[PDB]
C-alpha cells in the first residue's frame, strides 16, 4: 500500500546491507569459473529491490556489473564513484515521466555505488557473475573519504557513522 | 503514442524473428565455457523488448534461462511448451493492477515459448549465458504440431504459416 502490498506480495525483507527491501528471486543452475573470483560462481542472480525516501542504500561495490531494471515507482538516483575517482550519477526510472531517466542502468564492476529515491521505487537487480558475499564490499565512511576526499558530501549522505 | 516514444527513445528496431521491437543494450565482457554451448559465451546480455497487440512473438527457444522483467504497459502472456510436452502460461505485469501478474518471469532453458499482449508492453529481457544465434531455434508450425499435437491451438495462434 503500495509499498506494503509489494513487500507482502513479493515477500521482501529489510536488506542487511541497505535502507531498502529485497528478496533473491533467481539463481542460475549454470556456473562460471571467472578470473578474479574465488571459486565457481553462478552465471546470474536476480533480486527484487524496493527503496523508500530517507534511507539511502549506502556505498558498496561488487566484482560484477550490476544491472538495475525499473519496475514501478519514482526515479532512483544511482550515485557512482569509479576507481579513477570520478563521480557520475545515473537516473533509473521512466523517461515518459522524467526525460533523463532510463529503465535500465548498468553499474560497472568495481564502481562504488549508492542509491536514493524521493518517493519509492521497485527495481529488479541482476548481477552476473551471480552475487556471492565473498565478492561484496560495504564501504566504510572513513576509508572512502580518505580515498575520495573530493566526494566527501555524497559519501557523508550515503554512509552510516 | 507511447509506443513510438519508447521506440524513439530506446532506439528499438523491429524484431527479425518477430514481433516485437528490440535492441541489445548490454553484453558482458566476461565469458564462460558452459557445457552444451558451442564456444565461449558472454555471461549476460540484455535487450529492451516491446510488444503490441495482434503480433505474437512466435514460438522459439534457446539454451539459457531467459528472464523477462516488466518495465511499462499492460500484461504479457508468456506461453510455454516444456520438453515433457506440458503447457503453462506465465503472466508478466504489475500485480497492483492485475493480481495474477508478476514483474519477473523466468523462462527455463529449452522450453518453447511465445508471447502476446492485449495492449503494449515494454520489457527488459536477459539471457545468461548471453544470447548467441547459434543457440536459437525458431519453431516451425509443422514440426511443433508433430511434436505437441495436444497444443495445436496455441501453436497455430503463435507461429507463421
Ligand atoms: N542475490 C543477491 N543477494 C544479495 C544482493 N545484495 C544482498 N544480497 C543478499 O543478502 C542476503 C542476506 O543474507 P545474510 O544477511 O548474510 O543472512 P542473514 O543476515 O543472517 O539473514 C543474501 O540472501 C544475499 O542474497 C544481490 O545483489 N543479489
Ligand atoms: N541479446 C539478445 N539479442 C537478441 C535476442 N533475440 C534476438 N536478438 C538479436 O537479434 C539481432 C539480430 O540482428 P539482425 O537485426 O537480425 O541483423 P540481420 O542479420 O541483418 O538481420 C542480434 O543483435 C541479436 O542480439 C535476445 O534475447 N537477446
mmCIF file of C-alpha atoms and ligand atoms in Angstrom:
data_model
loop_
_atom_site.group_PDB
_atom_site.id
_atom_site.type_symbol
_atom_site.label_atom_id
_atom_site.label_comp_id
_atom_site.label_asym_id
_atom_site.label_seq_id
_atom_site.Cartn_x
_atom_site.Cartn_y
_atom_site.Cartn_z
ATOM 1 C CA UNK A 1 0.000 0.000 0.000
ATOM 2 C CA UNK A 2 1.530 0.462 -2.238
ATOM 3 C CA UNK A 3 4.921 -0.220 -0.711
ATOM 4 C CA UNK A 4 3.427 -2.757 1.767
ATOM 5 C CA UNK A 5 1.447 -4.508 -0.931
ATOM 6 C CA UNK A 6 4.639 -5.020 -2.815
ATOM 7 C CA UNK A 7 6.540 -6.126 0.296
ATOM 8 C CA UNK A 8 3.706 -8.600 1.022
ATOM 9 C CA UNK A 9 3.301 -9.740 -2.465
ATOM 10 C CA UNK A 10 6.984 -10.152 -3.248
ATOM 11 C CA UNK A 11 7.990 -11.288 0.250
ATOM 12 C CA UNK A 12 10.675 -8.685 0.604
ATOM 13 C CA UNK A 13 12.667 -8.400 3.777
ATOM 14 C CA UNK A 14 14.835 -5.496 5.110
ATOM 15 C CA UNK A 15 18.226 -5.701 3.218
ATOM 16 C CA UNK A 16 21.064 -6.384 5.806
ATOM 17 C CA UNK A 17 23.469 -4.030 3.970
ATOM 18 C CA UNK A 18 20.953 -1.264 2.959
ATOM 19 C CA UNK A 19 17.938 1.064 3.861
ATOM 20 C CA UNK A 20 15.727 -0.950 1.461
ATOM 21 C CA UNK A 21 13.914 -4.235 0.918
ATOM 22 C CA UNK A 22 14.800 -7.254 -1.115
ATOM 23 C CA UNK A 23 14.496 -10.964 -1.949
ATOM 24 C CA UNK A 24 16.671 -13.002 -4.277
ATOM 25 C CA UNK A 25 14.272 -14.465 -6.725
ATOM 26 C CA UNK A 26 16.523 -16.377 -9.051
ATOM 27 C CA UNK A 27 19.883 -18.068 -9.026
ATOM 28 C CA UNK A 28 21.058 -19.854 -12.150
ATOM 29 C CA UNK A 29 21.982 -23.574 -12.147
ATOM 30 C CA UNK A 30 24.817 -22.705 -14.623
ATOM 31 C CA UNK A 31 28.376 -21.918 -13.237
ATOM 32 C CA UNK A 32 31.288 -19.831 -14.469
ATOM 33 C CA UNK A 33 34.831 -20.072 -13.398
ATOM 34 C CA UNK A 34 35.933 -16.387 -13.787
ATOM 35 C CA UNK A 35 39.362 -14.880 -13.078
ATOM 36 C CA UNK A 36 39.226 -12.596 -10.084
ATOM 37 C CA UNK A 37 36.562 -14.721 -8.480
ATOM 38 C CA UNK A 38 37.420 -17.042 -5.586
ATOM 39 C CA UNK A 39 35.620 -20.211 -6.731
ATOM 40 C CA UNK A 40 32.798 -21.115 -9.160
ATOM 41 C CA UNK A 41 30.023 -18.630 -9.464
ATOM 42 C CA UNK A 42 26.550 -18.766 -10.748
ATOM 43 C CA UNK A 43 26.040 -17.178 -14.102
ATOM 44 C CA UNK A 44 23.190 -14.974 -12.893
ATOM 45 C CA UNK A 45 21.276 -13.980 -9.758
ATOM 46 C CA UNK A 46 18.301 -11.576 -9.624
ATOM 47 C CA UNK A 47 16.677 -9.803 -6.625
ATOM 48 C CA UNK A 48 13.651 -7.552 -6.244
ATOM 49 C CA UNK A 49 14.861 -4.367 -4.544
ATOM 50 C CA UNK A 50 12.477 -1.730 -3.167
ATOM 51 C CA UNK A 51 13.555 1.595 -1.755
ATOM 52 C CA UNK A 52 11.845 4.382 0.143
ATOM 53 C CA UNK A 53 12.738 8.022 0.732
ATOM 54 C CA UNK A 54 15.090 8.892 3.525
ATOM 55 C CA UNK A 55 17.086 5.747 3.706
ATOM 56 C CA UNK A 56 19.954 5.627 1.213
ATOM 57 C CA UNK A 57 21.393 2.293 0.195
ATOM 58 C CA UNK A 58 24.978 3.148 1.219
ATOM 59 C CA UNK A 59 28.170 2.992 -0.886
ATOM 60 C CA UNK A 60 29.157 -0.519 -1.776
ATOM 61 C CA UNK A 61 30.681 -2.476 -4.608
ATOM 62 C CA UNK A 62 30.905 -5.970 -6.058
ATOM 63 C CA UNK A 63 33.064 -7.751 -8.707
ATOM 64 C CA UNK A 64 30.387 -7.900 -11.414
ATOM 65 C CA UNK A 65 28.429 -5.416 -13.457
ATOM 66 C CA UNK A 66 25.202 -4.835 -11.604
ATOM 67 C CA UNK A 67 22.128 -4.252 -13.772
ATOM 68 C CA UNK A 68 19.193 -2.335 -12.407
ATOM 69 C CA UNK A 69 15.797 -2.525 -14.097
ATOM 70 C CA UNK A 70 12.913 -0.225 -13.159
ATOM 71 C CA UNK A 71 9.632 -1.965 -12.373
ATOM 72 C CA UNK A 72 7.488 0.676 -10.554
ATOM 73 C CA UNK A 73 7.508 3.942 -8.679
ATOM 74 C CA UNK A 74 9.563 7.089 -8.874
ATOM 75 C CA UNK A 75 13.130 7.526 -10.052
ATOM 76 C CA UNK A 76 16.194 6.231 -8.324
ATOM 77 C CA UNK A 77 19.454 8.117 -8.240
ATOM 78 C CA UNK A 78 22.367 5.821 -8.541
ATOM 79 C CA UNK A 79 25.482 7.591 -7.295
ATOM 80 C CA UNK A 80 28.771 6.249 -8.600
ATOM 81 C CA UNK A 81 32.388 6.765 -7.610
ATOM 82 C CA UNK A 82 34.535 4.944 -10.221
ATOM 83 C CA UNK A 83 38.111 3.662 -9.470
ATOM 84 C CA UNK A 84 39.735 6.631 -11.290
ATOM 85 C CA UNK A 85 37.996 8.804 -8.651
ATOM 86 C CA UNK A 86 35.350 10.379 -10.912
ATOM 87 C CA UNK A 87 31.744 10.762 -9.931
ATOM 88 C CA UNK A 88 28.678 10.125 -12.091
ATOM 89 C CA UNK A 89 25.002 9.722 -11.444
ATOM 90 C CA UNK A 90 22.511 7.642 -13.393
ATOM 91 C CA UNK A 91 18.768 8.106 -13.104
ATOM 92 C CA UNK A 92 16.799 4.808 -13.090
ATOM 93 C CA UNK A 93 13.144 5.431 -13.968
ATOM 94 C CA UNK A 94 10.585 6.056 -16.722
ATOM 95 C CA UNK A 95 11.567 8.596 -19.452
ATOM 96 C CA UNK A 96 7.830 9.042 -20.249
ATOM 97 C CA UNK A 97 7.553 10.883 -16.851
ATOM 98 C CA UNK A 98 11.148 12.047 -16.393
ATOM 99 C CA UNK A 99 13.107 12.503 -19.649
ATOM 100 C CA UNK A 100 16.508 11.980 -18.136
ATOM 101 C CA UNK A 101 15.539 8.681 -16.567
ATOM 102 C CA UNK A 102 16.192 5.196 -18.119
ATOM 103 C CA UNK A 103 14.519 1.828 -17.435
ATOM 104 C CA UNK A 104 17.955 0.123 -17.351
ATOM 105 C CA UNK A 105 21.136 1.149 -15.663
ATOM 106 C CA UNK A 106 24.240 -0.942 -15.590
ATOM 107 C CA UNK A 107 26.674 -0.220 -12.800
ATOM 108 C CA UNK A 108 30.206 -1.229 -13.924
ATOM 109 C CA UNK A 109 32.011 -3.700 -11.724
ATOM 110 C CA UNK A 110 34.236 -2.161 -9.058
ATOM 111 C CA UNK A 111 32.457 1.152 -9.091
ATOM 112 C CA UNK A 112 31.302 2.230 -5.574
ATOM 113 C CA UNK A 113 27.634 2.928 -5.682
ATOM 114 C CA UNK A 114 24.764 4.051 -3.510
ATOM 115 C CA UNK A 115 21.191 4.876 -4.295
ATOM 116 C CA UNK A 116 18.388 7.219 -3.223
ATOM 117 C CA UNK A 117 14.764 7.907 -4.190
ATOM 118 C CA UNK A 118 12.359 10.796 -3.496
ATOM 119 C CA UNK A 119 9.273 8.500 -3.196
ATOM 120 C CA UNK A 120 9.697 4.772 -3.644
ATOM 121 C CA UNK A 121 10.994 2.617 -6.442
ATOM 122 C CA UNK A 122 10.694 -1.097 -7.090
ATOM 123 C CA UNK A 123 13.594 -2.443 -9.131
ATOM 124 C CA UNK A 124 14.799 -5.834 -10.322
ATOM 125 C CA UNK A 125 18.551 -6.004 -9.880
ATOM 126 C CA UNK A 126 20.683 -8.526 -11.688
ATOM 127 C CA UNK A 127 24.364 -9.438 -11.247
ATOM 128 C CA UNK A 128 26.496 -11.626 -13.480
ATOM 129 C CA UNK A 129 28.630 -13.452 -12.413
ATOM 130 C CA UNK A 130 25.988 -14.090 -9.737
ATOM 131 C CA UNK A 131 26.066 -12.484 -6.278
ATOM 132 C CA UNK A 132 28.112 -14.067 -3.565
ATOM 133 C CA UNK A 133 29.088 -12.359 -0.269
ATOM 134 C CA UNK A 134 32.790 -13.078 -0.806
ATOM 135 C CA UNK A 135 32.662 -10.566 -3.662
ATOM 136 C CA UNK A 136 30.775 -7.850 -1.769
ATOM 137 C CA UNK A 137 32.362 -4.807 -0.040
ATOM 138 C CA UNK A 138 30.430 -2.469 2.179
ATOM 139 C CA UNK A 139 32.229 0.828 2.116
ATOM 140 C CA UNK A 140 33.410 2.465 5.368
ATOM 141 C CA UNK A 141 32.847 6.251 5.663
ATOM 142 C CA UNK A 142 36.402 6.976 6.809
ATOM 143 C CA UNK A 143 38.139 4.785 4.225
ATOM 144 C CA UNK A 144 36.098 6.302 1.410
ATOM 145 C CA UNK A 145 36.673 9.901 2.484
ATOM 146 C CA UNK A 146 40.395 9.075 2.682
ATOM 147 C CA UNK A 147 40.319 7.542 -0.828
ATOM 148 C CA UNK A 148 37.978 10.171 -2.395
ATOM 149 C CA UNK A 149 38.219 13.465 -0.355
ATOM 150 C CA UNK A 150 36.656 15.479 -3.193
ATOM 151 C CA UNK A 151 33.423 13.457 -2.851
ATOM 152 C CA UNK A 152 33.058 13.984 0.880
ATOM 153 C CA UNK A 153 29.452 15.303 0.591
ATOM 154 C CA UNK A 154 27.962 12.399 -1.250
ATOM 155 C CA UNK A 155 29.959 9.992 0.866
ATOM 156 C CA UNK A 156 28.533 11.602 4.050
ATOM 157 C CA UNK A 157 24.968 11.437 2.741
ATOM 158 C CA UNK A 158 25.410 7.737 1.727
ATOM 159 C CA UNK A 159 27.306 6.006 4.526
ATOM 160 C CA UNK A 160 26.481 5.258 8.195
ATOM 161 C CA UNK A 161 28.599 6.869 11.014
ATOM 162 C CA UNK B 1 1.596 7.316 -28.984
ATOM 163 C CA UNK B 2 3.522 5.892 -26.020
ATOM 164 C CA UNK B 3 4.796 3.090 -28.166
ATOM 165 C CA UNK B 4 6.611 5.381 -30.642
ATOM 166 C CA UNK B 5 8.109 7.466 -27.832
ATOM 167 C CA UNK B 6 9.627 4.286 -26.439
ATOM 168 C CA UNK B 7 10.690 3.097 -29.887
ATOM 169 C CA UNK B 8 12.271 6.518 -30.485
ATOM 170 C CA UNK B 9 13.842 6.955 -27.138
ATOM 171 C CA UNK B 10 15.168 3.412 -26.717
ATOM 172 C CA UNK B 11 16.141 3.056 -30.439
ATOM 173 C CA UNK B 12 14.192 -0.135 -30.935
ATOM 174 C CA UNK B 13 14.123 -1.788 -34.300
ATOM 175 C CA UNK B 14 11.547 -4.423 -35.446
ATOM 176 C CA UNK B 15 12.481 -7.996 -34.254
ATOM 177 C CA UNK B 16 13.930 -10.243 -37.083
ATOM 178 C CA UNK B 17 12.015 -13.243 -35.745
ATOM 179 C CA UNK B 18 9.045 -11.048 -34.606
ATOM 180 C CA UNK B 19 7.192 -9.347 -33.132
ATOM 181 C CA UNK B 20 8.072 -7.150 -31.398
ATOM 182 C CA UNK B 21 10.665 -4.320 -31.206
ATOM 183 C CA UNK B 22 14.038 -4.738 -29.625
ATOM 184 C CA UNK B 23 17.655 -3.569 -29.131
ATOM 185 C CA UNK B 24 20.517 -5.345 -27.359
ATOM 186 C CA UNK B 25 21.585 -2.811 -24.728
ATOM 187 C CA UNK B 26 24.221 -4.811 -22.892
ATOM 188 C CA UNK B 27 26.622 -7.677 -23.416
ATOM 189 C CA UNK B 28 29.041 -8.583 -20.698
ATOM 190 C CA UNK B 29 32.773 -8.583 -21.021
ATOM 191 C CA UNK B 30 33.013 -11.788 -19.002
ATOM 192 C CA UNK B 31 32.870 -15.172 -20.689
ATOM 193 C CA UNK B 32 32.190 -18.700 -19.517
ATOM 194 C CA UNK B 33 32.503 -22.084 -21.224
ATOM 195 C CA UNK B 34 29.211 -23.809 -20.409
ATOM 196 C CA UNK B 35 28.700 -27.447 -21.419
ATOM 197 C CA UNK B 36 26.256 -27.761 -24.277
ATOM 198 C CA UNK B 37 27.308 -24.443 -25.665
ATOM 199 C CA UNK B 38 29.330 -24.450 -28.898
ATOM 200 C CA UNK B 39 32.111 -21.971 -27.851
ATOM 201 C CA UNK B 40 32.510 -19.333 -25.131
ATOM 202 C CA UNK B 41 29.600 -17.075 -24.310
ATOM 203 C CA UNK B 42 29.097 -13.830 -22.588
ATOM 204 C CA UNK B 43 27.694 -14.402 -19.074
ATOM 205 C CA UNK B 44 24.790 -11.970 -19.707
ATOM 206 C CA UNK B 45 23.074 -9.951 -22.432
ATOM 207 C CA UNK B 46 20.036 -7.723 -22.072
ATOM 208 C CA UNK B 47 17.551 -6.241 -24.637
ATOM 209 C CA UNK B 48 14.593 -3.897 -24.440
ATOM 210 C CA UNK B 49 11.706 -5.787 -25.945
ATOM 211 C CA UNK B 50 8.450 -4.061 -26.821
ATOM 212 C CA UNK B 51 5.310 -5.743 -27.935
ATOM 213 C CA UNK B 52 1.957 -4.667 -29.258
ATOM 214 C CA UNK B 53 -1.345 -6.377 -29.703
ATOM 215 C CA UNK B 54 -2.038 -8.634 -32.628
ATOM 216 C CA UNK B 55 1.526 -9.570 -33.233
ATOM 217 C CA UNK B 56 2.630 -12.636 -31.239
ATOM 218 C CA UNK B 57 6.313 -13.316 -30.821
ATOM 219 C CA UNK B 58 6.206 -16.816 -32.247
ATOM 220 C CA UNK B 59 7.377 -19.974 -30.565
ATOM 221 C CA UNK B 60 11.110 -20.270 -30.106
ATOM 222 C CA UNK B 61 13.644 -21.458 -27.597
ATOM 223 C CA UNK B 62 17.268 -21.063 -26.585
ATOM 224 C CA UNK B 63 19.759 -22.944 -24.420
ATOM 225 C CA UNK B 64 19.595 -20.437 -21.486
ATOM 226 C CA UNK B 65 17.015 -19.489 -18.876
ATOM 227 C CA UNK B 66 15.542 -16.319 -20.242
ATOM 228 C CA UNK B 67 14.394 -13.669 -17.745
ATOM 229 C CA UNK B 68 11.677 -11.164 -18.535
ATOM 230 C CA UNK B 69 11.290 -8.033 -16.442
ATOM 231 C CA UNK B 70 8.260 -5.751 -16.832
ATOM 232 C CA UNK B 71 9.026 -2.072 -17.363
ATOM 233 C CA UNK B 72 5.780 -0.436 -18.705
ATOM 234 C CA UNK B 73 2.324 -1.106 -20.159
ATOM 235 C CA UNK B 74 -0.088 -3.994 -19.908
ATOM 236 C CA UNK B 75 0.404 -7.694 -19.157
ATOM 237 C CA UNK B 76 2.194 -10.112 -21.396
ATOM 238 C CA UNK B 77 1.107 -13.754 -21.731
ATOM 239 C CA UNK B 78 4.125 -15.978 -21.889
ATOM 240 C CA UNK B 79 3.087 -19.323 -23.388
ATOM 241 C CA UNK B 80 5.330 -22.230 -22.597
ATOM 242 C CA UNK B 81 5.523 -25.734 -24.031
ATOM 243 C CA UNK B 82 8.043 -27.643 -21.851
ATOM 244 C CA UNK B 83 10.169 -30.595 -23.091
ATOM 245 C CA UNK B 84 7.844 -33.116 -21.391
ATOM 246 C CA UNK B 85 5.025 -31.631 -23.571
ATOM 247 C CA UNK B 86 3.070 -29.860 -20.820
ATOM 248 C CA UNK B 87 1.737 -26.338 -21.230
ATOM 249 C CA UNK B 88 1.939 -23.469 -18.733
ATOM 250 C CA UNK B 89 1.375 -19.725 -19.102
ATOM 251 C CA UNK B 90 3.072 -17.043 -17.042
ATOM 252 C CA UNK B 91 1.707 -13.543 -16.810
ATOM 253 C CA UNK B 92 4.313 -10.801 -16.826
ATOM 254 C CA UNK B 93 2.918 -7.491 -15.476
ATOM 255 C CA UNK B 94 2.055 -5.392 -12.421
ATOM 256 C CA UNK B 95 0.204 -7.302 -9.655
ATOM 257 C CA UNK B 96 -1.113 -3.984 -8.280
ATOM 258 C CA UNK B 97 -3.355 -3.802 -11.432
ATOM 259 C CA UNK B 98 -3.698 -7.469 -12.240
ATOM 260 C CA UNK B 99 -3.366 -9.756 -9.154
ATOM 261 C CA UNK B 100 -2.055 -12.714 -11.073
ATOM 262 C CA UNK B 101 0.714 -10.852 -12.987
ATOM 263 C CA UNK B 102 4.421 -10.698 -11.852
ATOM 264 C CA UNK B 103 7.265 -8.254 -12.606
ATOM 265 C CA UNK B 104 9.671 -11.108 -13.270
ATOM 266 C CA UNK B 105 9.198 -14.301 -15.214
ATOM 267 C CA UNK B 106 11.977 -16.761 -15.865
ATOM 268 C CA UNK B 107 11.530 -18.999 -18.925
ATOM 269 C CA UNK B 108 13.530 -22.208 -18.281
ATOM 270 C CA UNK B 109 16.059 -23.074 -20.947
ATOM 271 C CA UNK B 110 14.785 -25.393 -23.643
ATOM 272 C CA UNK B 111 11.175 -24.502 -23.187
ATOM 273 C CA UNK B 112 9.368 -23.451 -26.399
ATOM 274 C CA UNK B 113 7.806 -20.105 -25.708
ATOM 275 C CA UNK B 114 5.770 -17.406 -27.333
ATOM 276 C CA UNK B 115 4.269 -14.172 -26.108
ATOM 277 C CA UNK B 116 1.224 -11.947 -26.604
ATOM 278 C CA UNK B 117 -0.219 -8.746 -25.093
ATOM 279 C CA UNK B 118 -3.563 -7.014 -25.212
ATOM 280 C CA UNK B 119 -2.153 -3.523 -25.481
ATOM 281 C CA UNK B 120 1.544 -2.991 -25.353
ATOM 282 C CA UNK B 121 4.312 -3.987 -23.044
ATOM 283 C CA UNK B 122 7.847 -2.847 -22.582
ATOM 284 C CA UNK B 123 10.090 -5.442 -21.046
ATOM 285 C CA UNK B 124 13.761 -5.929 -20.414
ATOM 286 C CA UNK B 125 14.847 -9.478 -21.264
ATOM 287 C CA UNK B 126 18.030 -11.041 -20.027
ATOM 288 C CA UNK B 127 19.740 -14.281 -21.055
ATOM 289 C CA UNK B 128 22.531 -15.977 -19.212
ATOM 290 C CA UNK B 129 24.581 -17.376 -20.703
ATOM 291 C CA UNK B 130 24.236 -14.452 -23.062
ATOM 292 C CA UNK B 131 22.347 -14.643 -26.334
ATOM 293 C CA UNK B 132 24.085 -16.022 -29.399
ATOM 294 C CA UNK B 133 22.276 -17.028 -32.576
ATOM 295 C CA UNK B 134 23.838 -20.484 -32.633
ATOM 296 C CA UNK B 135 21.721 -21.280 -29.554
ATOM 297 C CA UNK B 136 18.450 -20.015 -31.011
ATOM 298 C CA UNK B 137 15.699 -22.052 -32.667
ATOM 299 C CA UNK B 138 12.631 -20.642 -34.326
ATOM 300 C CA UNK B 139 9.732 -23.051 -34.124
ATOM 301 C CA UNK B 140 8.210 -24.394 -37.314
ATOM 302 C CA UNK B 141 4.437 -24.858 -37.286
ATOM 303 C CA UNK B 142 4.660 -28.388 -38.730
ATOM 304 C CA UNK B 143 7.430 -29.744 -36.570
ATOM 305 C CA UNK B 144 5.826 -28.361 -33.428
ATOM 306 C CA UNK B 145 2.427 -29.791 -34.173
ATOM 307 C CA UNK B 146 4.031 -33.090 -34.941
ATOM 308 C CA UNK B 147 5.719 -32.928 -31.594
ATOM 309 C CA UNK B 148 2.959 -31.488 -29.467
ATOM 310 C CA UNK B 149 -0.384 -32.365 -31.169
ATOM 311 C CA UNK B 150 -2.317 -31.645 -27.932
ATOM 312 C CA UNK B 151 -1.331 -27.964 -28.193
ATOM 313 C CA UNK B 152 -2.340 -27.355 -31.802
ATOM 314 C CA UNK B 153 -4.472 -24.290 -30.941
ATOM 315 C CA UNK B 154 -1.745 -22.353 -29.256
ATOM 316 C CA UNK B 155 0.883 -23.409 -31.796
ATOM 317 C CA UNK B 156 -1.495 -22.218 -34.575
ATOM 318 C CA UNK B 157 -2.011 -18.848 -32.882
ATOM 319 C CA UNK B 158 1.791 -18.382 -32.364
ATOM 320 C CA UNK B 159 3.554 -19.483 -35.491
ATOM 321 C CA UNK B 160 3.625 -18.242 -39.037
ATOM 322 C CA UNK B 161 2.254 -20.210 -41.989
HETATM 323 N N1 LIG C 1 21.390 -12.412 -4.810
HETATM 324 C C1 LIG C 1 21.704 -11.243 -4.277
HETATM 325 N N2 LIG C 1 21.693 -11.207 -2.960
HETATM 326 C C2 LIG C 1 22.004 -10.105 -2.316
HETATM 327 C C3 LIG C 1 22.322 -8.903 -3.063
HETATM 328 N N3 LIG C 1 22.587 -7.995 -2.118
HETATM 329 C C4 LIG C 1 22.413 -8.560 -0.912
HETATM 330 N N4 LIG C 1 22.088 -9.841 -1.051
HETATM 331 C C5 LIG C 1 21.724 -10.857 -0.041
HETATM 332 O O1 LIG C 1 21.935 -10.636 1.338
HETATM 333 C C6 LIG C 1 21.168 -11.739 1.818
HETATM 334 C C7 LIG C 1 21.189 -11.895 3.341
HETATM 335 O O2 LIG C 1 21.939 -12.993 3.819
HETATM 336 P P1 LIG C 1 22.705 -12.718 5.201
HETATM 337 O O3 LIG C 1 22.495 -11.289 5.593
HETATM 338 O O4 LIG C 1 24.186 -12.968 5.171
HETATM 339 O O5 LIG C 1 21.974 -13.722 6.208
HETATM 340 P P2 LIG C 1 21.230 -13.135 7.480
HETATM 341 O O6 LIG C 1 21.637 -11.711 7.684
HETATM 342 O O7 LIG C 1 21.680 -13.912 8.681
HETATM 343 O O8 LIG C 1 19.735 -13.247 7.323
HETATM 344 C C8 LIG C 1 21.578 -12.931 0.966
HETATM 345 O O9 LIG C 1 20.443 -13.672 0.532
HETATM 346 C C9 LIG C 1 22.141 -12.278 -0.264
HETATM 347 O O10 LIG C 1 21.445 -12.827 -1.357
HETATM 348 C C10 LIG C 1 22.301 -9.031 -4.553
HETATM 349 O O11 LIG C 1 22.556 -8.134 -5.339
HETATM 350 N N5 LIG C 1 21.996 -10.203 -5.054
HETATM 351 N N1 LIG C 2 20.919 -10.117 -26.985
HETATM 352 C C1 LIG C 2 19.814 -10.668 -27.474
HETATM 353 N N2 LIG C 2 19.660 -10.498 -28.765
HETATM 354 C C2 LIG C 2 18.627 -10.991 -29.383
HETATM 355 C C3 LIG C 2 17.625 -11.712 -28.643
HETATM 356 N N3 LIG C 2 16.733 -12.076 -29.566
HETATM 357 C C4 LIG C 2 17.133 -11.600 -30.755
HETATM 358 N N4 LIG C 2 18.292 -10.972 -30.619
HETATM 359 C C5 LIG C 2 19.103 -10.233 -31.586
HETATM 360 O O1 LIG C 2 18.828 -10.414 -32.943
HETATM 361 C C6 LIG C 2 19.729 -9.488 -33.518
HETATM 362 C C7 LIG C 2 19.892 -9.843 -34.964
HETATM 363 O O2 LIG C 2 20.317 -8.697 -35.651
HETATM 364 P P1 LIG C 2 19.547 -8.508 -37.006
HETATM 365 O O3 LIG C 2 18.627 -7.322 -36.836
HETATM 366 O O4 LIG C 2 18.836 -9.807 -37.236
HETATM 367 O O5 LIG C 2 20.649 -8.308 -38.164
HETATM 368 P P2 LIG C 2 20.499 -9.121 -39.536
HETATM 369 O O6 LIG C 2 21.291 -10.403 -39.502
HETATM 370 O O7 LIG C 2 20.960 -8.285 -40.686
HETATM 371 O O8 LIG C 2 19.043 -9.429 -39.739
HETATM 372 C C8 LIG C 2 21.023 -9.589 -32.732
HETATM 373 O O9 LIG C 2 21.509 -8.288 -32.368
HETATM 374 C C9 LIG C 2 20.593 -10.352 -31.500
HETATM 375 O O10 LIG C 2 21.030 -9.633 -30.385
HETATM 376 C C10 LIG C 2 17.878 -11.851 -27.187
HETATM 377 O O11 LIG C 2 17.142 -12.433 -26.429
HETATM 378 N N5 LIG C 2 18.960 -11.324 -26.692
#
